[PDB]
Amino acid sequence: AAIYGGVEGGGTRSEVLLVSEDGKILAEADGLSTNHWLIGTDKCVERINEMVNRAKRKAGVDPLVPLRSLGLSLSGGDQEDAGRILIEELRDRFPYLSESYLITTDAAGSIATATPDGGVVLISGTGSNCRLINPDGSESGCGGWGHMMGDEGSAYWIAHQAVKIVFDSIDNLEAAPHDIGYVKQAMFHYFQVPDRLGILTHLYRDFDKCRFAGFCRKIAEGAQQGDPLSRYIFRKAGEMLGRHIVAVLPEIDPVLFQGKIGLPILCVGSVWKSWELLKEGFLLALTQGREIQAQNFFSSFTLMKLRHSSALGGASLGARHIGHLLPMDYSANAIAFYSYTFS
Amino acid sequence: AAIYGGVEGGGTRSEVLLVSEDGKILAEADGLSTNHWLIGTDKCVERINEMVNRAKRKAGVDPLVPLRSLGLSLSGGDQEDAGRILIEELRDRFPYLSESYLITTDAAGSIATATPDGGVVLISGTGSNCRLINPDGSESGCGGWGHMMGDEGSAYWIAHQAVKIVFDSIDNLEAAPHDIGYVKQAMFHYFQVPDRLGILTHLYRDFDKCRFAGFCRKIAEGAQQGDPLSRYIFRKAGEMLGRHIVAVLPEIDPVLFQGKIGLPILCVGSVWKSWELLKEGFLLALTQGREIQAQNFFSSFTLMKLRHSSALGGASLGARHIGHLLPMDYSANAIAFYSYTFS
Numbered sequence A, B: 001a002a003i004y005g006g007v008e009g010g011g012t013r014s015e016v017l018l019v020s021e022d023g024k025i026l027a028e029a030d031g032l033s034t035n036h037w038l039i040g041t042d043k044c045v046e047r048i049n050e051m052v053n054r055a056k057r058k059a060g061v062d063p064l065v066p067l068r069s070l071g072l073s074l075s076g077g078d079q080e081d082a083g084r085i086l087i088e089e090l091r092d093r094f095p096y097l098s099e100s101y102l103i104t105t106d107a108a109g110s111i112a113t114a115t116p117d118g119g120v121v122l123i124s125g126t127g128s129n130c131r132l133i134n135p136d137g138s139e140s141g142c143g144g145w146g147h148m149m150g151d152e153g154s155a156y157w158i159a160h161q162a163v164k165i166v167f168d169s170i171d172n173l174e175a176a177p178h179d180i181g182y183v184k185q186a187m188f189h190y191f192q193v194p195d196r197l198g199i200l201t202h203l204y205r206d207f208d209k210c211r212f213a214g215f216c217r218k219i220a221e222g223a224q225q226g227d228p229l230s231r232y233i234f235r236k237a238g239e240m241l242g243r244h245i246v247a248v249l250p251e252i253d254p255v256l257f258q259g260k261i262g263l264p265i266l267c268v269g270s271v272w273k274s275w276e277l278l279k280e281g282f283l284l285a286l287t288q289g290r291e292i293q294a295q296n297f298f299s300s301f302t303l304m305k306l307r308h309s310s311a312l313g314g315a316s317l318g319a320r321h322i323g324h325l326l327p328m329d330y331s332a333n334a335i336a337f338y339s340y341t342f343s
């Protein structure tokens, strides 16, 4: 049995799948965090090696035989490649783990799970990113620069607009579009501080990007219960997300438009659980972005969700990096959830 | 002889002025940081006592003779109610230091040095902030929230605009108002990196707020040398600083608009060195904002810079606090660099 493995990590979820020669998924094991910014490359190496061994036991596979390849689909933030270093520390500490390594990106590992010839992903999790891989080599992207330089339409951004808007309102630097009450109270309560000064501590001493972006869930709840300000912030995240697509539009190979689905857009990230709250902003940004840019027309799009971990894409790409091609059941890996054709 | 002290503290450099009954300066001593975050409060207490005693000795005043008052003008604003405590530990440990104390914001100390009545303090350094002090002493503000949640029109905000605009241009998420070329080259040079990926380490792993805000100076040169885009960023900075004034306007005591000087606005910070580049933006924001809000006065304003320590202001406030009006040469204390009367 020749085994190929993929890893999903870098963000909040971490996971390993192992795949056989024939593309049959052998086992899945969940793991501890592999965000290399919060944890070092020492721990990263440790949790990856545990994860894979546990999965090997689970699959009924020879514990001593090294993986043919291991495809690591990781949300970089900075591809400052210490991904190079991760591979080096990996083959240094555990030489029996795998014969070969591939570090890719979360976007490329997702795309790889859904289609055999590239496509388009829109990511909205704690951060955001939009990426494209054409049927030929060509790649292209918009805005995966993290929290200090963009992330428009992410959980961070939704959270940041939320506090930015109350700060500016009280200050009289800008008038809010709708009442400040619910969010102002949600804020103080979530961060457990009485006033605006209390919020500074969480920004510059503490700073917990994870806690901060968590605030998005409270805006989502408030929006669901009809608080206009909350509904507003989710509309604008819809636009920002829609704009990422508009941005990459000129770079898309025309054949990707010309099917029954039309342009398939893979939607990765938990913010998409609030799709109903993003829908209008998203539809708007696209609708105004096809007047300004292209009479060279795509007629429709459909949105898709993954049904297996991006680790499956990882495994796929890890095999591709060596000799092999892993068979893939692309119908099973992703499903349609929304469709729209411009009228 | 009655003697009246002030301290400019809270930042990295401290100062003490001993002022006599008819306003002449008796002694002055420099000191290091008096920031309780960086140093703890005990060390702050020690260093204040040390500075003041060194000022007494210079003046031929024994350590056992207390001041009639001491006005501590303490930056690191907003959260300066560790002041009640710094005063207690002071009159606990060193009872002969002073017979009276006043904790002042750095803004209150600052204006009290330039004019007798209230005014506005407008800061644009690494960060930015705007504080209004009324004739009656009541103080309020706009901004001061730091690089993650405002600092509009500061050194940091300027550098950040520069690199955001070019990031969004290459991404095609937002077309720049003017050509990206000059600034793009300035960026790559200043952070000494090959590409955008290289800028990302300077924002996450190797982050240095001071280094990053330093990039402002480069945009100043660009704007000086004639580059359309660098000029534009400095116009927007001017606007944001303008809008800080517009924010507090509704709170100003009408009588503050009434001098021959009009509204006194003290400018603190190094970005003010680029006044020529902020001027148009500053004016445009003041024009369209004083119109929105019925201009029942606000006929004019003059912008000032300081020429003495805010400690002089501190001395003055400490003395008023105990019923003594300290003679104060406001002309020697600060100079006016611009005057504008709306027409």
Ligand SMILES: Nc1ncnc2c1ncn2[C@@H]1O[C@H](COP(=O)(O)OP(=O)(O)O)[C@@H](O)[C@H]1O
Pocket (backbone or CB within 6 Å): A010, A011, A012, A013, A124, A125, A126, A127, A155, A156, A210, A213, A214, A215, A216, A217, A220, A268, A269, A270, A271, A272, A273, A274
């Ligand atoms: N229903 C929801 N609506 C909007 N945001 C959500 C929802 N559930 C989770 N989130 C946000 O998802 C973010 C985490 O993104 P996720 O894709 O789960 O992980 P990561 O992006 O870190 O890999 C959290 O910051 C949280 O606020």
Ligand SMILES: Nc1ncnc2c1ncn2[C@@H]1O[C@H](COP(=O)(O)OP(=O)(O)O)[C@@H](O)[C@H]1O
Pocket (backbone or CB within 6 Å): B124, B125, B126, B127, B155, B156, B210, B213, B214, B215, B216, B217, B220, B268, B269, B270, B271, B272, B273, B274
């Ligand atoms: N001539 C200038 N024009 C514009 N910005 C400047 C100039 N000189 C210095 N700066 C900016 O001022 C910032 C430092 O501000 P300063 O007021 O001196 O100290 P701080 O704000 O840290 O107390 C630096 O980030 C620098 O980029």
Ligand SMILES: OC[C@H]1O[C@H](O)[C@H](O)[C@@H](O)[C@@H]1O
Pocket (backbone or CB within 6 Å): A011, A075, A076, A077, A078, A106, A107, A123, A124, A125, A126, A127, A128, A129, A143, A144, A145, A146, A147, A151
């Ligand atoms: O996860 C979505 C995005 O979050 C952040 O912006 C990261 O810099 C980027 O690599 C990631 O893809």
Ligand SMILES: OC[C@H]1O[C@H](O)[C@H](O)[C@@H](O)[C@@H]1O
Pocket (backbone or CB within 6 Å): B076, B077, B078, B123, B125, B126, B127, B128, B129, B144, B145, B146, B147, B151
């Ligand atoms: O120094 C200018 C300003 O910079 C930062 O924004 C600080 O939060 C603020 O308190 C300070 O006054």
